Scaffold this active site. Structure first.
Site, PDB file in Angstrom:
ATOM      1  N   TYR A 239       0.844  -1.191   0.000  1.00 46.61           N
ATOM      2  CA  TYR A 239       0.000   0.000   0.000  1.00 46.61           C
ATOM      3  C   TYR A 239       0.879   1.240   0.000  1.00 46.61           C
ATOM      4  CZ  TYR A 239      -4.409   2.486   1.222  1.00 46.61           C
ATOM      5  OH  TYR A 239      -5.515   3.316   1.250  1.00 46.61           O
TER       6      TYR A 239
ATOM      7  N   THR B 192     -22.425  -8.344  -0.894  1.00 46.15           N
ATOM      8  CA  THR B 192     -22.486  -8.585   0.550  1.00 46.15           C
ATOM      9  C   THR B 192     -21.391  -7.862   1.345  1.00 46.15           C
ATOM     10  OG1 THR B 192     -21.153 -10.608   0.386  1.00 46.15           O
ATOM     11  CG2 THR B 192     -23.561 -10.846   0.248  1.00 46.15           C
TER      12      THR B 192
ATOM     13  N   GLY C  15     -11.582  -1.992  -5.820  1.00 39.39           N
ATOM     14  CA  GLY C  15     -11.077  -3.128  -5.062  1.00 39.39           C
ATOM     15  C   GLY C  15     -10.705  -4.269  -5.985  1.00 39.39           C
ATOM     16  N   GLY C  16      -9.981  -5.248  -5.433  1.00 38.05           N
ATOM     17  CA  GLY C  16      -9.597  -6.415  -6.207  1.00 38.05           C
ATOM     18  C   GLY C  16      -9.575  -7.702  -5.409  1.00 38.05           C
TER      19      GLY C  16
ATOM     20  N   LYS D 125     -16.639  -8.628   8.562  1.00 34.64           N
ATOM     21  CA  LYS D 125     -15.922  -7.531   9.201  1.00 34.64           C
ATOM     22  C   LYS D 125     -15.666  -7.812  10.674  1.00 34.64           C
ATOM     23  CE  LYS D 125     -15.061  -4.205   7.323  1.00 34.64           C
ATOM     24  NZ  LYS D 125     -13.789  -4.026   6.606  1.00 34.64           N
TER      25      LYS D 125
HETATM   26  N1  LIG Z   1     -10.618   2.406  -3.087  1.00 31.97           N
HETATM   27  C1  LIG Z   1     -11.026   2.757  -1.875  1.00 31.97           C
HETATM   28  O1  LIG Z   1     -11.037   3.944  -1.610  1.00 31.97           O
HETATM   29  C2  LIG Z   1     -11.509   1.758  -0.847  1.00 31.97           C
HETATM   30  C3  LIG Z   1     -11.804   2.153   0.457  1.00 31.97           C
HETATM   31  C4  LIG Z   1     -12.263   1.217   1.380  1.00 31.97           C
HETATM   32  C5  LIG Z   1     -12.459  -0.191   1.032  1.00 31.97           C
HETATM   33  N2  LIG Z   1     -12.124  -0.515  -0.361  1.00 31.97           N
HETATM   34  C6  LIG Z   1     -12.265  -1.868  -0.924  1.00 31.97           C
HETATM   35  O2  LIG Z   1     -13.639  -2.254  -0.978  1.00 31.97           O
HETATM   36  C7  LIG Z   1     -13.746  -3.672  -0.944  1.00 31.97           C
HETATM   37  C8  LIG Z   1     -14.701  -4.109   0.153  1.00 31.97           C
HETATM   38  O3  LIG Z   1     -14.272  -3.568   1.409  1.00 31.97           O
HETATM   39  P1  LIG Z   1     -14.994  -4.030   2.770  1.00 31.97           P
HETATM   40  O4  LIG Z   1     -14.388  -3.223   3.884  1.00 31.97           O
HETATM   41  O5  LIG Z   1     -16.470  -3.773   2.616  1.00 31.97           O
HETATM   42  O6  LIG Z   1     -14.662  -5.604   3.007  1.00 31.97           O
HETATM   43  P2  LIG Z   1     -15.643  -6.759   3.578  1.00 31.97           P
HETATM   44  O7  LIG Z   1     -16.760  -6.191   4.424  1.00 31.97           O
HETATM   45  O8  LIG Z   1     -14.807  -7.693   4.419  1.00 31.97           O
HETATM   46  O9  LIG Z   1     -16.262  -7.568   2.345  1.00 31.97           O
HETATM   47  C9  LIG Z   1     -15.434  -8.427   1.576  1.00 31.97           C
HETATM   48  C10 LIG Z   1     -16.173  -8.791   0.296  1.00 31.97           C
HETATM   49  O10 LIG Z   1     -15.345  -9.489  -0.643  1.00 31.97           O
HETATM   50  C11 LIG Z   1     -16.049 -10.649  -1.125  1.00 31.97           C
HETATM   51  N3  LIG Z   1     -15.043 -11.607  -1.618  1.00 31.97           N
HETATM   52  C12 LIG Z   1     -13.944 -11.989  -0.945  1.00 31.97           C
HETATM   53  N4  LIG Z   1     -13.197 -12.835  -1.698  1.00 31.97           N
HETATM   54  C13 LIG Z   1     -13.817 -12.972  -2.882  1.00 31.97           C
HETATM   55  C14 LIG Z   1     -13.545 -13.727  -4.121  1.00 31.97           C
HETATM   56  N5  LIG Z   1     -12.427 -14.501  -4.199  1.00 31.97           N
HETATM   57  N6  LIG Z   1     -14.442 -13.598  -5.123  1.00 31.97           N
HETATM   58  C15 LIG Z   1     -15.544 -12.822  -5.018  1.00 31.97           C
HETATM   59  N7  LIG Z   1     -15.847 -12.116  -3.916  1.00 31.97           N
HETATM   60  C16 LIG Z   1     -15.031 -12.148  -2.835  1.00 31.97           C
HETATM   61  C17 LIG Z   1     -16.904 -11.077   0.045  1.00 31.97           C
HETATM   62  O11 LIG Z   1     -17.985 -11.874  -0.411  1.00 31.97           O
HETATM   63  P3  LIG Z   1     -18.530 -13.134   0.412  1.00 31.97           P
HETATM   64  O12 LIG Z   1     -19.627 -12.726   1.351  1.00 31.97           O
HETATM   65  O13 LIG Z   1     -19.047 -14.118  -0.616  1.00 31.97           O
HETATM   66  O14 LIG Z   1     -17.357 -13.708   1.185  1.00 31.97           O
HETATM   67  C18 LIG Z   1     -17.350  -9.709   0.549  1.00 31.97           C
HETATM   68  O15 LIG Z   1     -18.425  -9.169  -0.227  1.00 31.97           O
HETATM   69  C19 LIG Z   1     -12.352  -4.187  -0.651  1.00 31.97           C
HETATM   70  O16 LIG Z   1     -11.758  -4.733  -1.835  1.00 31.97           O
HETATM   71  C20 LIG Z   1     -11.597  -2.971  -0.135  1.00 31.97           C
HETATM   72  O17 LIG Z   1     -10.197  -3.094  -0.397  1.00 31.97           O
HETATM   73  C21 LIG Z   1     -11.696   0.426  -1.200  1.00 31.97           C
END
Ligand SMILES: NC(=O)c1ccc[n+]([C@@H]2O[C@H](COP(=O)([O-])OP(=O)(O)OC[C@H]3O[C@@H](n4cnc5c(N)ncnc54)[C@H](OP(=O)(O)O)[C@@H]3O)[C@@H](O)[C@H]2O)c1
Ligand SMILES: C/C=C/C(=O)SCCNC(=O)CCNC(=O)[C@@H](O)C(C)(C)COP(=O)(O)OP(=O)(O)OC[C@H]1O[C@@H](n2cnc3c(N)ncnc32)[C@H](O)[C@@H]1OP(=O)(O)O
Ligand SMILES: C/C=C/C(=O)SCCNC(=O)CCNC(=O)[C@@H](O)C(C)(C)COP(=O)(O)OP(=O)(O)OC[C@H]1O[C@@H](n2cnc3c(N)ncnc32)[C@H](O)[C@@H]1OP(=O)(O)O
Ligand SMILES: NC(=O)c1ccc[n+]([C@@H]2O[C@H](COP(=O)([O-])OP(=O)(O)OC[C@H]3O[C@@H](n4cnc5c(N)ncnc54)[C@H](OP(=O)(O)O)[C@@H]3O)[C@@H](O)[C@H]2O)c1
Ligand SMILES: [Cl-]
Lengths: 365, 365
Positions: free
Chosen positions: B58, B178, B276-277, B360
């Site tokens: 990062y 989700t 995200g990725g 989370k």
């Molecule tokens: N660019 C930015 O400014 C910024 C800021 C904050 C967060 N983000 C990004 O936003 C995304 C979500 O953040 P979050 O805090 O909400 O995390 P989170 O609550 O832990 O949610 C994780 C998500 O990823 C899914 N997932 C995990 N592995 C996967 C795979 N191999 N294939 C398909 N889906 C998968 C999960 O689905 P399941 O329920 O099926 O497990 C769940 O929906 C992250 O990638 C994070 O890095 C970006």
């Protein structure tokens, strides 16, 4: 008093080697409506979009009609070409016999010997006698006229309509460097004082090809292997650092690993325009370029950009004509084949399709 | 007297399971500079960016210091969290003991029991006692405060700052349905009257999950299989066409096949924001979408958009707080773990990192 013409048609989509045929039809020169015009073909090229159109995967295609005298509706082929005016109707004043014209719209059908249309179906080009009368050193050639409406406009608009590059400083990078479009882009980059890198596939006579592209206008030429190399990155960063500029624009007509490579080389807030996919691979971009480097990836389609923008089409076309008349711009050369009646017209275009791997093909009359 | 505190640190990058440790340090409450403040942590979450920072991938990182009493330079962990003010200096007027605050800048270090900072390192939130005294129907919970500064703002800004969606007609589509960010996006879509499709992975309890997402605000919910299906395609186009609107915006945090799927569902001139990725696969777009559909693909990074735009940050935050106080917005729930001194602090966050697939994680104090 009746003209016999030939046209290359198809009644269903498929590979050109399978679906194309020649149709004879007749044009009546003594019965012209007030605004009608008769033209005779001088030459028309084989371009990749002409082939996709026949294949059924291009989403802009002429309607199928019985207008050439078929029982089944058939569509003509070819979107660009150069024509000479034979006769005009009572009310035509914008054209006269002897003028050179191109089609004003796509889907006109240019793989044929003659056409009957209205005056507004055409755009007038200067013929060599008219260029000479205005004191210009050069008049267009057949190949320059027959290919002016697509590839030069594609290159000009991608360089000038989306990102403003500072002359003498900024860079663009393009793959497909040996293509007809890539060669117009290197020339236009040179005439506008833009720096550029061309990416090409390696070959045994690589040194002669690099020399030709640098004469056309590329600043540096690299192979696809150097494009893939992390060891080679630093030397591209150094080229850009010494110019005082930035790499702001990327031009992609290949796809695959090539499109990823030229994207990584842009500075932050870069833009890539995809206008082709010769490799049949999709565009693949790492997530980290979008988020951390604010990279943007967009498309370009000249047919769709100029649909209702006659003004932008006209002024871009006038600039290309002016560069040809002064000798500052040269054409991407073609391999020419003359139609003389000893061989069906549709077979000359089938040969042009099959030999496009040798370079741009032009059928002349 | 003297406060004994604990902080989760690392002296070199690596996997959190390998490089993190707990460090004891002491804060002197009787010798505060005029503008200093002491805070006690109430809760701090484990976010994907926190892990990437510890790993060294990062590009936004706190400096390594010996300020916590280590012999080698060490860095703190965690960028967001909720704190309670313990004491303020003589010259502080914007905060007082008992206030709830979040960090005003990134890289503060939130995986710890206490912190010493300046007044301007914090942003004040209304706590429940103040919401009640000001007549508001609801006050924040610990979890709502500890997660307010990132994921709710991400969803809001992606939906309003790039494309104008017509209320009551237009659509957006998102994968990661989700996720915490996905759930805030559905709620904001309902509050602004945007239509939306959420793409999720299949589960045994799919029907109950679909009901929950529709209750939050998604208009339709589909699985990744339906997202990939050529045969199901027509049914998604009808949802949009019958609404009178268009699908203009796609939100991607997965990559891979999932990002191709949601891009195909947009109308012409659509836009995709990659933020995200999660699948570790790059973004893959067919060449025909760029050319024939005028598709655009860009990135979103909230840290960089708000870096020097505090007015946009402030107003976006105030809108989320208002929605919480009026009961119109609900939080993405967390799995909570309480630190009580019987288990080193760094092992709670190591367990939180390892159990993030369960949803989370939040560490509370
Ligand atoms: N660019 C930015 O400014 C910024 C800021 C904050 C967060 N983000 C990004 O936003 C995304 C979500 O953040 P979050 O805090 O909400 O995390 P989170 O609550 O832990 O949610 C994780 C998500 O990823 C899914 N997932 C995990 N592995 C996967 C795979 N191999 N294939 C398909 N889906 C998968 C999960 O689905 P399941 O329920 O099926 O497990 C769940 O929906 C992250 O990638 C994070 O890095 C970006
Ligand atoms: C006026 C001239 C316009 C053009 O030349 S359009 C560009 C066509 N580009 C090419 O590179 C030809 C390659 N072959 C194709 O099939 C081109 O249509 C193509 C590259 C998109 C094919 O499109 P895709 O395979 O990328 O997308 P699909 O959804 O059809 O699969
Ligand atoms: C303020 C918050 C910002 C963010 O959360 S953005 C970080 C996005 N990270 C993720 O989505 C987790 C999975 N992806 C990655 O690990 C990402 O960083 C990742 C950068 C290794 C994904 O790798 P890439 O696809 O970008 O390829 P690389 O060139 O970086 O290798
Ligand atoms: N979007 C638009 O508006 C628009 C309009 C017109 C044309 N175009 C596109 O522009 C591109 C070039 O058109 P053109 O008329 O210049 O065609 P062209 O003259 O026939 O040139 C094609 C070139 O592509 C290269 N090539 C072929 N296969 C390749 C591969 N697998 N990897 C890398 N390079 C490869 C060849 O280089 P080698 O010398 O190495 O064989 C060849 O010189 C095409 O993709 C065409 O569809 C787009
Ligand atoms: Cl309460």
């Amino acid at each position: 008093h009746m003209i016999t013409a030939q046209a290359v048609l198809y009644t269903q989509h498929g590979e050109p080697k399978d679906v194309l045929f020649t149709q004879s039809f007749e044009i009546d020169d003594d019965n012209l409506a007030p605004n009608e015009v008769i033209v005779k073909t001088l030459g028309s090229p084989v371009n990749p979009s002409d082939i996709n159109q026949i294949q059924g995967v291009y989403p802009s295609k002429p309607a199928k009609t019985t207008g050439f005298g078929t029982t089944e509706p058939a569509a003509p082929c070819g979107n660009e070409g150069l024509f000479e005016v034979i006769k005009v109707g009572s009310n035509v004043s914008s054209l006269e016999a002897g003028d050179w014209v191109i089609p004003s719209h796509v889907n006109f059908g240019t793989w044929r010997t003659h056409a009957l249309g209205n005056d507004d179906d055409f755009i007038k080009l200067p013929n060599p006698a008219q260029s000479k009368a205005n004191g210009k050193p050069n008049g267009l050639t057949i190949n320059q006229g027959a290919t002016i409406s697509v590839n030069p406009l594609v290159a000009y608009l991608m360089l000038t309509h989306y990102v403003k590059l500072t002359p003498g400083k900024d860079w663009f990078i393009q793959n497909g460097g040996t293509s007809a479009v890539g060669k117009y882009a290197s020339q236009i980059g040179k005439l506008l004082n833009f720096n550029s890198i061309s990416v090409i596939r390696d070959r045994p006579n690589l040194d002669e090809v690099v020399a030709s592209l640098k004469e056309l206008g590329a600043t540096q030429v690299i192979t696809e292997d150097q494009n893939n190399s992390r060891e080679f990155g630093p030397t591209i960063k150094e080229w850009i650092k010494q110019s005082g500029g930035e790499a702001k624009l990327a031009l992609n007509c290949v796809g695959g690993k090539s499109s990823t490579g030229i994207a990584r080389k842009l500075n932050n807030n870069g833009l890539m325009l995809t206008y082709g996919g010769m490799s049949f691979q999709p565009v693949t971009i790492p997530t980290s370029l979008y988020i951390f480097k604010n990279f943007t990836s967009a498309g370009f389609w000249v047919t769709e950009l100029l649909k209702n923008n006659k003004e932008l089409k006209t002024s871009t076309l006038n600039q290309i004509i002016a560069w040809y008349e002064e000798g500052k711009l040269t054409d991407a050369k073609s391999i020419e084949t003359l139609y003389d009646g000893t061989k069906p017209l549709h077979e000359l275009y089938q040969d042009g399709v099959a030999n496009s791997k040798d370079g741009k093909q032009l059928i002349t009359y």
